[PDB]
TrEMBL record, chains A, B, C:
Protein's name according to its UniProt entry: Copper-containing nitrite reductase
Cofactor(s) recorded in Swiss-Prot or TrEMBL: Cu(2+); Cu(+)
Residues holding Cu(2+) 12: H86, T231, V232
Record: residues binding Cu(2+) 11: H83, H117
Species assigned in the record: Geobacillus thermodenitrificans (strain NG80-2)
Residues the record lists as binding Cu(2+) 6: D38
GO molecular function: copper ion binding; nitrite reductase (NO-forming) activity
Assigned keywords, A-Z: Copper, Metal-binding, Oxidoreductase, Repeat, Signal
Shown residues in whole-protein numbering: 47 to 341 of 352
Domain named Plastocyanin-like: residues: 32-141, 179-293
Residues given in the record as Cu(2+) 17 binding sites: E222
Domain of life, per lineage: Bacteria
Chain positions recorded as Cu(2+) 14 binding sites: E152
Keyword Metal-binding: yes
Record lineage: Bacteria, Bacillati, Bacillota, Bacilli, Bacillales
Length: 295, 295, 295
């Protein structure tokens, strides 16, 4: 796209504020930003806020979201679809033109770990170019295992293809498959989908802790066979809904856009890989690390 | 196949009648019929009754099915495998030769949303050429959420490949991935697996309704990441068995041949896309529409 | 690999002995062994004990495993990762050099049907070349349906690619997809992952029996849509954990490394195919047979 040549829009922070007991404002941008997806490989991603996946959003069950999208793309329209919400797609997930803003309002009344993404046709193109993310909706009454959890992180799986190549997006294998982590609390890492960051700078934990991961596989195209090496999931909540409670799973099947909350114990010091167990995808990048120490 | 050149057998209605409190007769054909799978693209499908997927069958839990297949194919044998039934494959799912009929009898004692398909070797060929469908077995005691449902439809996912090309069937990506709808009540649409019909003539609903979809992914080869844009599934019953009850799922993973009953609320007027969230497949056809109006 | 040319190490029996009420010794080899994966097609597999998948391991919930790997490979290091265990990957799943042995100790405190595999980088290579298997951990309190089961077998799904070809492992479709069976009791068959053995020498059962299968899809790369023709699963326990109990499933979705216990009734004499319902994979080998007779 001629109007994207040389464009690299600096990342913009997510803006969010609570405006009532059950109402929250969220302001995001659509922007074109160079991301290093593998060592030496730059992808001029289509993004929310200059991150791919986009920034984490966390709301409470029952919150209405008043969402604004500021489109900084010079030429392509963009939009937003939150899987958390009940909305009219053809009224509420509509396009925002270049250099314009749009505000849409909709309720999040289901707890869980939801995908969000651009909804502009062709949706495959917009998702594959980087316009995906996660929204977490925290359950009003928690999870039954909350009191057991010592530490928590967010992980997101996505794929990358040949740049802006619809034939490859539709017909080709992924070039890379990757994990990212998005911060829940100060000090947590906040990364983009690349093949290396979470190997070189592992997530951290302490021996004996029960870890919770909020996970989502945004695709665009693959399913995920999510596994943590050296442990078994004690508890799994499919899509993050507390009712969908499995126990003692080695591996969690996630559809494309599929989420879960998973909990596991790390019993011994060491480095614990986190993979999709579709090992072609692991080989193409989808291995993160969790470094477990005595402190 | 030389004996299929120029052959286009007009669709024949499904014949079904109840013959006792727990016994039903079903009569289907195997036939060769031209279907427009994408605009301008004709596939000379191998079909049941001139539809691909085939006609919907609905029986009650505990019904014995007395099934007749009339093979109108001039040269290829065909057969029938209902996933609903307990049967001897090597006695009851056997071939019916060209211009012959065969009758087989077997019980449907499990509720759910089951695939049916031709079982003639090579099964991949027969399924990929169009010989798939769904049988619904209604549970004796219903679903716990029945009283909440306002409207219901059947949707089926399938893929199409290069015509009668076993190399492509085994080794290639799908050319198209598609939804169809099959009628449960008079006035419901009844369509074939194509890339366009359910976009141009959306399924219809009213604002505020709870919708039930009976769904099955017949493959042959892909899994499905089933999602309705702008809502969350309130309730999911895997394979349509009332015991396999999930809640608040954004997306339902369906294996090949996998079914479900899913229920969701449409809260606002508008058009709601229905997708597999493996967006390469969505781009290749697998997007249906649900138009929601005030009336 | 020059040092594998002409190498064909005869299979070595698994060695296992109980050494306390809650402690077991297991001794396995890593070895290079020619396996006929399809008629006329030899793969010089990387194996545990000269089988691919490797030998079955069965322990009780709460057993600590004291595992020794004897590496008979002349040049490549190997390792062992049991998905059943809680362990430090970077201390306990480490490499054993050529012509050396290593012993690692770790507890199996979760019931189920777990993958095991070599964990040596690149893990894709080691798994794809044949270094996979299953460990079953029997639940302390059984499954609620135990008293109903008449007969049981183990089945494992794996794929085979072009020989030792990392490009194909990462980017290519499988050449073959296959089932194997591993013995639980004397007289049970014990086979390797090939396209033919379980078709020519079917698993055996009697009319009217309830059959339990312990199943795992080891991949490396594909998910599995597990189905038995002519029946419906009465009960399914995901990953073999008794809590993850589904009923009346036609088809069980297994992620890569995913397991289950499945139970079904064979009501009529005959031969019942067992498939992954991703029929491209079935066509490439993944069809086993269960021959059901009056005796
Ligand atoms: Cu309030
Ligand atoms: Cu507001
Ligand atoms: Cu966009
Ligand atoms: Cu979506
Ligand atoms: Cu792929
Ligand atoms: Cu703790
Ligand atoms: Cu664990
Ligand atoms: Cu009766
Ligand atoms: Cu009759
Ligand atoms: Cu046929
Ligand atoms: Cu089938
Ligand atoms: Cu495909
Ligand atoms: Cu209503
Ligand atoms: Cu909803
Ligand atoms: Cu004891
Ligand atoms: Cu010992
Ligand atoms: Cu190895
Ligand atoms: Cu593993
Ligand atoms: Cu494949
Ligand atoms: Cu019995
Ligand atoms: Cu059955």
């Amino acid at each position: 796209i001629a109007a994207h040549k040389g464009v690299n829009q600096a990342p913009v922070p997510l803006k969010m504020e609570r405006v009532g007991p059950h109402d929250v404002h969220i302001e995001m941008t659509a922007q074109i930003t160079d991301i290093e997806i593998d060592k030496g490989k730059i992808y001029k991603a289509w993004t929310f806020n200059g991150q791919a996946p986009g920034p984490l959003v966390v709301v409470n069950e029952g919150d209405t979201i008043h969402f604004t999208l500021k489109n900084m793309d010079p030429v392509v329209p963009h939009s937003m679809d939150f899987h958390a919400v009940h909305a009219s797609p053809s009224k509420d997930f509509i396009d925002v033109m270049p250099n314009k803003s749009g505000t849409f309002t909709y309720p999040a009344n289901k707890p869980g770990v939801f995908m969000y993404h651009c909804g502009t046709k062709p949706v495959l193109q917009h998702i594959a170019n980087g316009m995906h993310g996660v929204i977490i909706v925290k359950p009003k009454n928690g999870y039954p295992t909350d009191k057991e959890v010592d530490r928590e992180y967010v992980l997101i799986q996505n794929e990358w293809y040949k740049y802006n190549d619809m034939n490859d997006f539709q017909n080709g294998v992924p070039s890379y498959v990757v994990f990212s982590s998005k911060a829940l609390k100060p000090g947590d890492p906040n990364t983009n989908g690349d093949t290396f960051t979470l190997k070189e700078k592992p997530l951290l934990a302490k021996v004996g802790e029960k870890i919770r991961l909020y996970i989502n596989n945004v695709g665009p195209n693959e399913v995920s066979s999510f596994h943590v090496v050296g442990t078994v999931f004690d508890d799994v909540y499919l899509d993050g809904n507390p009712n969908n409670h499995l126990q003692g799973m080695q591996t969690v099947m996630l559809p494309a856009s599929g989420g879960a909350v998973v909990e596991f114990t790390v019993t011994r010091p060491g480095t614990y890989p986190i993979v999709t167990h579709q090992f072609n995808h692991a080989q193409k990048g989808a291995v993160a690390m969790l470094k477990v120490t005595e402190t």
